[PDB]
């Protein structure tokens, strides 16, 4: 089970040193946003663990004073060659913090600077239960479970047992809509994304994908809660919105934003976790599966778009 | 004095419950971004306080399990009427968490929902030492000092004593460059901002200001570090960059991004904390004063852009 033995080993080694009190997720690029679910998890669920999510550049230049024997550092680099991330592992080990590295390349330079190395599923026919985002999440779940206890551990593991099926079925479900979407937006140059909660990172990554396709302007990834507290992104540019409608504790925040956008007759492509079958996961843990769903369904849309025209 | 006393009272009141262990900053709009320095401060400096920064809507819909008698919740709403932020204070109090509210309007509805209230300076000619961003930072400084102790307390108070004169001087120093910036970019409907570190929220707010002026597309506020690990924002749009060059521990991260934008001849307006005299504040605390510098200098550039051509504080 992802991360369970690794975490066991760390909890054992650090007991003598006062135990694990601080968790740091450190990466760049796609690997940074892929750790947002783990951050959201520990913020919501923990009482005696701190969590920090850091860009590798910022961590190595300005490391927290809590970095030391009561910290664990989880670094991610897909190819295992990102220099700032490697330096982050080194600095952590120099401070006495056990390092877990997440990489797809098991003989990469990063591996020499980690205490533990974990890999994940990637590419063709990837099993979502073992993907990089889910291993990040499982590090947080196991760290909580093995230090303070986690009341919804079994429900979480239930979710892991269901998510691959949910995702691949959703990919088929949206295939046709994706073709239509592609025809409607093929001549747009800018598209905003919108999201909230533990899946927000997947909306950020989708903003990058849109920019990689259109190559015009990197536009905002808008937090659903922020529309009523700033200037509305409604101008004569007529920018459309790719709207991530979550399941779980922030669904109501999303629903309020969506209703607003509809009242102004905006062009909106909605991807809705409730319509794509996520709701079989228990409501105690479903927030944490939004990222894995959307991050794995958007490619169907992105591929259709492309045809119509650091992980 | 006020924030110090407010925090003393909370430490007295919560001692019997095990004391304060968790700090939450909760707000919307500009008040969310102005709390970024306080979040950065506790992440850098604390060993036994958690800190969480939340949008008010997210907080009231998904409050943390640690919200309880060992938590302090700091809320901010300039006009004291933001409904989600009011509900956040209310939810905090129901869980037994002391609430400190920051508002300019001392009889706003927020006030009735807080345990303690701190006001601040605001408007033309204000004393920067007492502005809302600074009161948010002092809440974190005092919470740390009065729980675990803070090794750079005196350096921090020294920086508070300097920040007003630095900003006033800087506002004058940039007057000329602001005029030429306005002329160079009056027809550019999209401009990226770039930043890192504890001042990042001031760059985000500057992104909002640019969009408010140009009203075309709300563009990315790019992190100086992430800049090298994504697709570079360099297209046939030829979008310029408004670059926040921080003082302190992330300056090297900014310098790397700047050197790269230069060595590709992009259009860049550089606003440099070190050129604007921030560095009389000690290296131990200077990170935390970037926001107050940039957030109070940018209006000069914005007023010039405006003359050459809603929002929650």
């Amino acid at each position: 089970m992802g991360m369970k033995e690794t975490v066991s080993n760390i909890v054992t080694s650090q007991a003598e040193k006062g135990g694990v009190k601080h968790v740091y997720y450190v990466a760049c690029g796609g690997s940074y946003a892929a750790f947002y679910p783990a951050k959201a998890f520990l913020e919501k669920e923990a009482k005696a663990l701190t969590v920090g999510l850091y860009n590798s550049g910022e961590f190595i230049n300005n490391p927290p004073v809590a970095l030391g024997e009561n910290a664990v550092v989880v670094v991610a680099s897909h190819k295992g060659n990102t220099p700032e991330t490697i330096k982050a592992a080194e600095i952590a080990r120099q401070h006495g913090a056990p390092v877990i590295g997440l990489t797809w390349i098991m003989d990469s330079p990063l591996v020499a600077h980690c205490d533990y190395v974990e890999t994940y599923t990637f590419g063709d026919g990837k099993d979502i239960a073992g993907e990089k985002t889910m291993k990040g999440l499982l590090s947080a779940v196991e760290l909580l479970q093995q230090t303070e206890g986690y009341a919804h551990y079994d429900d979480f593991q239930d979710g892991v047992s269901k998510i691959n099926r949910i995702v691949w079925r959703a990919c088929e479900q949206v295939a046709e809509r994706a073709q239509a979407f592609a025809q409607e937006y093929k001549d747009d140059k800018v598209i905003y994304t919108v999201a909230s909660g533990a899946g927000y990172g997947a909306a950020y990554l989708q903003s990058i994908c849109i920019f990689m396709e259109m190559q015009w302007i990197h536009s905002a990834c808008i937090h659903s809660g922020e529309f009523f507290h700033g200037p509305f992104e409604i101008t004569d540019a007529n920018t459309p919105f790719f709207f991530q409608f979550s399941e779980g504790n922030t669904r109501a925040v999303d629903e309020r934003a969506l209703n607003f956008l509809k009242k102004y007759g905006r062009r909106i492509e909605v991807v809705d976790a409730a319509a794509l079958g996520l709701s079989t996961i228990k409501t105690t843990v479903i927030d944490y599966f939004n990222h894995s769903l959307f991050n794995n369904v958007y490619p169907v849309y992105n591929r259709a778009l492309a045809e119509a025209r650091e992980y």
Side-chain angles (χ1 to χ4, degrees), chain A residues 1-188 190-311:
Chain A
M1 297 168 70
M3 291 285 170
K4 182 171 177 133
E5 166 185 300
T6 288
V7 168
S8 204
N9 283 156
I10 287 159
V11 166
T12 292
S13 76
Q14 300 318 105
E16 174 168 352
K17 287 143 181 194
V20 181
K21 297 202 195 66
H22 307 100
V23 189
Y24 297 107
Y25 289 95
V26 186
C28 302
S31 288
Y32 170 90
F35 281 152
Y36 191 79
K39 176 199 167 278
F41 180 89
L42 290 175
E43 287 191 333
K44 166 66 177 204
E45 303 290 356
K47 284 162 185 145
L49 244 27
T50 73
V51 59
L53 171 61
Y54 285 77
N55 162 87
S56 301
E58 180 154 343
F59 182 81
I60 68 177
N61 280 276
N62 194 29
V65 305
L67 183 59
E69 68 184 7
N70 309 111
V72 177
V73 171
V74 189
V75 293
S77 175
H78 177 67
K79 286 162 152 156
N81 67 346
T82 316
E84 300 94 309
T85 306
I86 292 160
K87 186 60 183 303
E90 185 196 291
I91 284 164
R93 293 222 307 180
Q94 294 171 166
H95 281 84
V99 173
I100 309 171
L102 223 35
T103 180
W104 165 252
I105 304 187
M106 303 309 284
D107 65 349
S108 61
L110 174 58
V111 168
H113 302 276
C114 302
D115 299 294
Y116 304 87
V117 178
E118 289 269 342
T119 195
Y120 46 81
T121 61
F122 184 72
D124 267 354
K126 176 179 80 153
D127 180 2
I128 307 309
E131 74 171 359
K132 178 170 75 164
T133 297
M134 192 58 41
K135 295 303 277 278
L137 269 160
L138 281 174
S139 72
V141 167
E142 289 296 343
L143 281 159
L144 187 64
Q145 171 68 345
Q146 296 194 40
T147 58
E148 316 180 14
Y150 173 39
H152 310 301
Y153 184 86
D154 290 338
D155 290 346
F156 197 95
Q157 296 300 343
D158 179 70
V160 175
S161 77
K162 288 174 169 179
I163 188 60
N164 193 60
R165 173 171 178 282
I166 290 166
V167 163
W168 290 113
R169 286 171 57 80
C171 290
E172 281 180 64
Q173 182 181 347
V174 300
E176 292 184 359
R177 180 49 208 174
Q179 295 291 312
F181 157 83
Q183 291 300 321
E184 289 152 51
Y185 291 96
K186 49 173 175 186
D187 303 305
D188 287 278
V190 172
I191 311 187
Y192 293 115
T193 65
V194 188
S196 64
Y200 177 90
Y204 182 78
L205 294 168
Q206 182 55 7
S207 287
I208 298 164
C209 290
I210 287 164
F211 177 62
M212 283 167 67
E213 179 51 42
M214 292 316 184
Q215 288 164 228
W216 192 248
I217 295 162
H218 182 191
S219 60
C221 179
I222 308 167
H223 181 100
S224 293
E226 280 298 335
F227 276 104
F228 312 106
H229 302 290
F232 314 147
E233 291 75 2
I234 294 168
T235 77
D236 298 341
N238 284 131
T239 313
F241 295 89
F242 198 94
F243 191 100
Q244 189 166 301
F245 195 5
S246 75
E247 271 274 60
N249 290 312
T250 67
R251 178 173 187 84
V253 182
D254 292 347
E255 180 152 344
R256 176 184 177 201
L258 182 55
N259 281 337
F260 161 89
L261 257 13
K262 286 167 163 175
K263 288 177 190 163
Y264 283 89
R266 307 326 297 181
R267 301 164 63 212
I268 317 161
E269 186 71 26
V270 353
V271 190
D272 181 355
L276 290 179
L278 196 68
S279 312
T280 59
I281 294 181
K282 295 209 188 298
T283 64
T284 51
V285 299
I286 194 171
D287 291 7
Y288 308 113
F289 292 89
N290 289 284
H291 182 121
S292 285
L293 176 66
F294 295 113
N295 183 237
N296 289 107
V297 165
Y298 291 139
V300 180
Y301 291 84
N302 295 339
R303 282 192 303 264
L305 228 202
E307 275 162 355
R309 296 162 44 73
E310 283 185 42
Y311 291 97

